[PDB]
Amino acid sequence: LDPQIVISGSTAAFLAIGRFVFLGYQRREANFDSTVGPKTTGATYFDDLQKNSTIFATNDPAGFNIIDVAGWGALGHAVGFAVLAINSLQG
Amino acid sequence: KAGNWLPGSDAPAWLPDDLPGNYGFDPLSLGKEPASLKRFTESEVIHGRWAMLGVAGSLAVELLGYGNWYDAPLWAVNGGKATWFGIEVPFDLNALLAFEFVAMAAAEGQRGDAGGVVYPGGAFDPLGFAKDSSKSGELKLKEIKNGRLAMVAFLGFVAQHAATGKGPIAALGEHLANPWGANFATNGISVPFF
Amino acid sequence: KAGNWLPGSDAPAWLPDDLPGNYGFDPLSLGKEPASLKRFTESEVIHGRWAMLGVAGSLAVELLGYGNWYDAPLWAVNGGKATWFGIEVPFDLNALLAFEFVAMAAAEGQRGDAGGVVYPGGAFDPLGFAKDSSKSGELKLKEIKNGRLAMVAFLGFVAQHAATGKGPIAALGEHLANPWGANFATNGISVPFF
Amino acid sequence: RQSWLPGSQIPAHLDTPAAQALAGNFGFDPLGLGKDPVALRWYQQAELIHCRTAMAGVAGILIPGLLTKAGALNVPEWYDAGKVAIENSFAPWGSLLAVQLFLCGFVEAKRWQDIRKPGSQGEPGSFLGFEASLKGTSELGYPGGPFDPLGLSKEADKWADWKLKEVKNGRLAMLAFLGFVAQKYATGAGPVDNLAAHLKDPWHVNYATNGVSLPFL
Amino acid sequence: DIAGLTPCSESKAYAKLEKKELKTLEKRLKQYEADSAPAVALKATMERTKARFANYAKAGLLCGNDGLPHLIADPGLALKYGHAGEVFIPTFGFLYVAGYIGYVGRQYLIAVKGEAKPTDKEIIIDVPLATKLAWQGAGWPLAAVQELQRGTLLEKEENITVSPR
C-alpha cells in the first residue's frame, strides 16, 4: 500500500509510455502551418505576450522539453492518486 | 463475389469485386466513399479477430468448468484471487490494470503507426501459410466469415445473459433438454405481449 | 432408358438417355437445368447408399434380437450402456459425439473436395468389379434401383413406427397372422373418417 | 363486356388491353384506386394472395364444421379451436407464433423479391439447386414448376377459365369469412347452426331480428 | 395499478360524486308536480345521469383521488392493460378522417388548376366535381402511399424560394 511505489511506478509508467510510443503521434500535431502559422503578425508588446518568445533547448536525442515531462508526469500523478484514492475507501 | 445477400437484387457500385467477404451487403450506403470504406475494412477485420478470441475464451472457460464469462471478474469486486487452469494468480486489480494499460497501449500504438495495415507478414506469419498470395485470398475469406460469425455469437452471449442470466453451455444444455419448453419465447423479456 | 414410368407419355427432353435409372420421371420439371440436375444425381446416389446402410442395419438389429431401431439409442437418455453383438461398449454420449463429429467431418470434407464424384475407383474398388466400364452401367442401374427401394422402405419405417409404434418384423409378423384384421386401415390414424 | 352496373361508365384505367387481360374483370372501381398501373399490379397480387388464403381458411372453417354434424370428426367451434388445440399441443403459443413468423417470413420475402423483379429468384448459385424452378411463368402471381404439380396449367384453352374460377371462388370466400366474423359477433353460435336456424324459420330468424345488426328498428 | 390509482368500480369517491349529483337533481325535482313536463325532463335527466355513470363504470375506466376518470396515453401501456379505446383508437380514427379531408381538398385543387380560370372555380364551387371527389377518396391512405412512392406528392425545387439567401 506504499504511496511511493504507487505514485513513482505510475509516473514512471506514464513517462515511459509518453517517451517511446506516443512521441511521433504527438509530433504529427505540431504541424499547424497548413492553417495557422501567424497566430499574431504583431510588432510590439501586447503582441509578443501572445507570440512565441523562448525555445526550450533539448540535447535529448528525441527532444523532450520540460513541457512534455510536465505533461506526462502530471497525468501520471493524477492516475496514481486516483489509484490510491480508490484504494482508500476501505478497499 | 463470395455470394449475394439477397438473390436477384443488384450489387452496389461502390463495393469492389476483389475483396474478402464481398456479398454486396449495404442497405444504408455506409461505404460509398473510398477512405471511409478502407477504414471500415480495417475495423471489420480487427473486430473479427477480437471477437474470435473472446468467444473462444468464454467457451473454453465454461467447457473446462471454471464458471461463466460473467463470473471470471468476480474475484475483484468481491474479495478473492484470480485463477488460471487450476492455479492461483498473484496480482492485484491495479497491478493487472497497470500492466494491461502499458502492454495494450504499446501494442496498439505500434500497430496504429503503420498506416492502416490488416495483413502483416514475416514475424506475424511464423508457420508459413499465405505465402503465394493465391490461396491467401481464400484464407482471407475464411477469416472474415468466421469473424462475422464470432461477432454475432458474442452479441448473442451479451443478450442471452442479459435475458436469462445463465451461461452459454448451461443454456444450450437446458434447451436440448426441452426444446419447445424454453427458448426466447419462454424468455418472458424478449417478446413482451406474451 | 431402363423403362417408362407411365406407358404412352413422352419422355422429358432434359433427361439424357445414358444415365442410370432414367425412367423419365419428372412431373414438376425439377431437373430441367444442367448444373442442378448434376447436383441431384449426386444427392440421389448418396441418399441411396445411406438408406441402404440404415435399412440393412435396422433389419439386422431386429432380426438378431436386440430391440428395434427405435430403442437402440435408449441407453443414453435413460441411464445405461451401449452394446453390439452381445458385448458392452465403453463410451459416453459425448465421447461418441466427439469421435462421430471428427470422423464424419473429416470423411465428408474429403469427399466434398473432389468436385462432385459419385464413382471413385482404385481403393474404393478393392475387389475388382466395374473395371471394363461395360457391365458397370448395369451395376449403376442395380445400385440406383436398390437405393430407391431402400429409401422408400426407410420412409416406411418412420411412418409405420409413427403410426403403430411397433418394429418392422413385429408388424410383419402380426400382419401375416391376420392380414385383413390389421393393416393401414385398422391403423386408426392413417385414414381418419373410418 | 360484363359490368358490375349495366349502364355505368366503366373507368378508363380498367379499359385497356393490360387491364382487360386480368382474371375476373368486371369494371368495379367506384373509388378510383387503380389509377396507377404499378399500383394495379400490386393490388392484383394482393387480391390473389387474399383469395388463396381466404379459400383455405374458409374451407377449414366449413368442412370440419359440416362434417361434425355427421358422426365423425368431433371438431370444436372455429372460435374455440385455438384453445383446445393448444391444450392438445406440446408447446406454448408464443413459440409457435415465433416459428411461424420465421418460416412464413422467409417465403413471403421470396415472393416479394419476385414481385419487385420478375425473373429474380432464378439466378445461378443462389439456392442449392431449386433456382432451376423458381422463375415465374410470364404472368406474375402464377408461378409454375413445383407449383401446379399435376400439369393442369399447361393447356392454353382452359387457361382463362381456370383463372376466372379461381378469382370468383376467392371473392366469394372472402365474403364468406367476413360473414363468419359478423355472425360470430352477432348471434353467438357456429355458422352451421346459423344456417340450420335460418332454414328452420326463415321469416323470423335473420338479421332483422337479432337486435344488434340494426338497432334503430 | 397504472401509476397509483384504482378503477372506478371500487373507487369510494366515484359513488360519492354519483350520490351528490343525484341529490342535487332530486332537490330540483322536489318542488314540482308528478305529471308536469318539468318533472318529465328532470326524470329524463336522472335516467341519463345514472346511465352515464353505469357506462363509465362498465368500460373499465381508472379514477384518481377525485373520483374522476383518467385517460392513459401510451401505446404499450394501454394496449397491455386494456385501454386502447381512449387514446389509441381515437387517434387512428381522427387521422383517418383528417387525412381524408385534406386529400379530398388537394384533389380538388389539382382538378381545378387545369382550367382556363382557376379563381372562378375556387370562389364558385364546382358542385358536381366537388361531390364526385367527395366520394372518390374514401380510401385515401392507399392513394397517398402510392403518390408518395411514385414521387408525385412532392414538388421539386421549382418552388419559389425567398430572395436572396
Ligand code: CLA
Ligand atoms: C464490427 C462491425 C462491422 C464493421 C465495421 C463492418 C464493416 C463492413 N462490412 Mg460487415 N459485418 C459485420 C460487422 C461489421 N462489418 C457482422 C457482424 C456481419 C455479420 C452479420 C457482417 C456482414 C457483412 C456482409 C454480409 C457484408 C459486410 C460488408 C462490409 C463492408 C461494407 C459495409 C459497410 O459500410 O460497413 C459499415 C458498417 C458499420 C458502420 C457498422 C457499424 C455498426 C452499426 C452502425 C450499428 C449496428 C447496431 C446493431 C445492429 C445493434 C444490434 C443489437 C441487438 C440487440 C439487435 C465494411 C467493410 C460488405 C462487404 O463487402 O464486406 C466486406 C458485405 O457484403 N458485412
Ligand code: CLA
Ligand atoms: C433423396 C431424394 C432424391 C433425389 C434428390 C432424386 C433425384 C433424382 N431422381 Mg429420384 N427417386 C427417389 C429419390 C430421389 N431422387 C426415390 C425415393 C425414388 C423412388 C420412389 C425415385 C425414383 C425416381 C425415378 C423413377 C426417376 C427419378 C429421377 C431422378 C432425377 C431427375 C428428377 C429430379 O429432378 O429429381 C429432383 C428430386 C428432388 C428435388 C426430390 C426432393 C424431395 C421433394 C422435394 C420432397 C419429397 C417429399 C415426399 C414426397 C414426402 C413424403 C411423405 C409421406 C408421408 C407421404 C434426379 C437425379 C429420374 C431419373 O432419370 O433418374 C435419375 C426418374 O425417371 N427418381
Ligand code: CLA
Ligand atoms: C458433420 C460433418 C459433415 C459435413 C461437413 C458434411 C458435408 C456434406 N454432406 Mg454430409 N452427412 C453427415 C455429416 C457431414 N456432411 C452425416 C453425419 C450424415 C448422416 C450419416 C450425412 C449425410 C449426407 C447425405 C445423405 C448427403 C450429404 C451431403 C453432403 C454435402 C452437401 C454439402 C451441403 O451444402 O449440405 C448442406 C446441408 C444442410 C445444411 C442440411 C440439409 C438438411 C436436409 C435438407 C434435411 C433433411 C430432412 C431431415 C433430416 C428430417 C428427416 C426426419 C426423419 C425422421 C425422416 C457435403 C459435402 C449431400 C451430398 O453429398 O450432396 C452433394 C448428401 O446427399 N451428407
Ligand code: CLA
Ligand atoms: C413518445 C415516446 C414514448 C415514451 C416516453 C414511452 C414510454 C414508455 N413506453 Mg412506449 N411507445 C411509444 C412511445 C412512447 N412510449 C410508441 C409510439 C409506441 C408504438 C411503437 C410505443 C410502444 C410501447 C410498447 C410496446 C411498450 C412501451 C413501453 C413503455 C414504457 C417503458 C419503456 C420505455 O420507456 O421505453 C423507452 C421509449 C422510448 C425511448 C420512446 C420510443 C418508443 C419505443 C418504441 C417503445 C419502447 C418499448 C420498450 C423497448 C419496452 C421495454 C419493456 C420493459 C418491460 C423494459 C414507458 C412508459 C413498455 C411498457 O408497457 O412498459 C411497462 C412496452 O412494452 N411502449
Ligand SMILES: CC1=C[C@H](O)CC(C)(C)[C@H]1/C=C/C(C)=C/C=C/C(C)=C/C=C/C=C(C)/C=C/C=C(C)/C=C/C1=C(C)C[C@H](O)CC1(C)C
Ligand atoms: C454490416 C452492416 C452494413 C449495413 O450497411 C448496415 C448495418 C446492417 C447496420 C451493418 C451491420 C452491422 C453489424 C450487425 C455489426 C455487428 C457488430 C458486432 C456484433 C460486433 C461485436 C464485436 C464483439 C467483440 C469484438 C467481442 C470481443 C469479446 C472479448 C474480447 C471477450 C473478452 C473477455 C474475455 C477474455 C473472457 C472473460 O470472461 C471476459 C471478457 C472480458 C468478456
Ligand SMILES: CC1=C[C@H](O)CC(C)(C)[C@H]1/C=C/C(C)=C/C=C/C(C)=C/C=C/C=C(C)/C=C/C=C(C)/C=C/C1=C(C)C[C@H](O)CC1(C)C
Ligand atoms: C423423384 C422426384 C421427382 C419428381 O419430379 C418430384 C418428386 C415426386 C417430388 C420427387 C420424389 C422424391 C421422393 C419421393 C423422395 C424420397 C426420398 C426419401 C424417402 C429419402 C430417404 C432417405 C433415407 C435415408 C438416407 C435413411 C438413412 C437411414 C439411416 C442412416 C439409419 C440410421 C440408423 C441406424 C444406423 C440404425 C439405428 O437403430 C438408428 C438410426 C440412426 C436410425
Ligand SMILES: CC1=C[C@H](O)CC(C)(C)[C@H]1/C=C/C(C)=C/C=C/C(C)=C/C=C/C=C(C)/C=C/C=C(C)/C=C/C1=C(C)C[C@H](O)CC1(C)C
Ligand atoms: C373491390 C374494391 C374496389 C374499389 O376500388 C373500392 C372498394 C369497393 C372499397 C373495394 C372493395 C373491397 C372489399 C369489399 C374487400 C373485402 C375484402 C375481404 C372481405 C377480405 C377478407 C379476407 C379474409 C381472409 C383472407 C380470411 C382468412 C381466414 C383464415 C386464415 C382463417 C384461419 C382459421 C382457420 C382456418 C380455422 C382456425 O380454427 C382458426 C382460424 C385462424 C380463424
Ligand SMILES: CC1=C(/C=C/C(C)=C/C=C/C(C)=C/C=C/C=C(C)/C=C/C=C(C)/C=C/C2=C(C)CCCC2(C)C)C(C)(C)CCC1
Ligand atoms: C536524467 C535522465 C533520466 C531520468 C529522467 C527522469 C526520471 C526525469 C523525471 C522527471 C519527473 C519525475 C518529472 C515529474 C513531474 C511531476 C509533475 C509535473 C507533477 C505534477 C503533479 C500534479 C499535476 C498533481 C496534481 C494534483 C494534486 C496537486 C493533488 C491530486 C490532484 C491533482 C492531480 C490535481 C534517465 C535515467 C531516464 C536517463 C536519461 C537522463
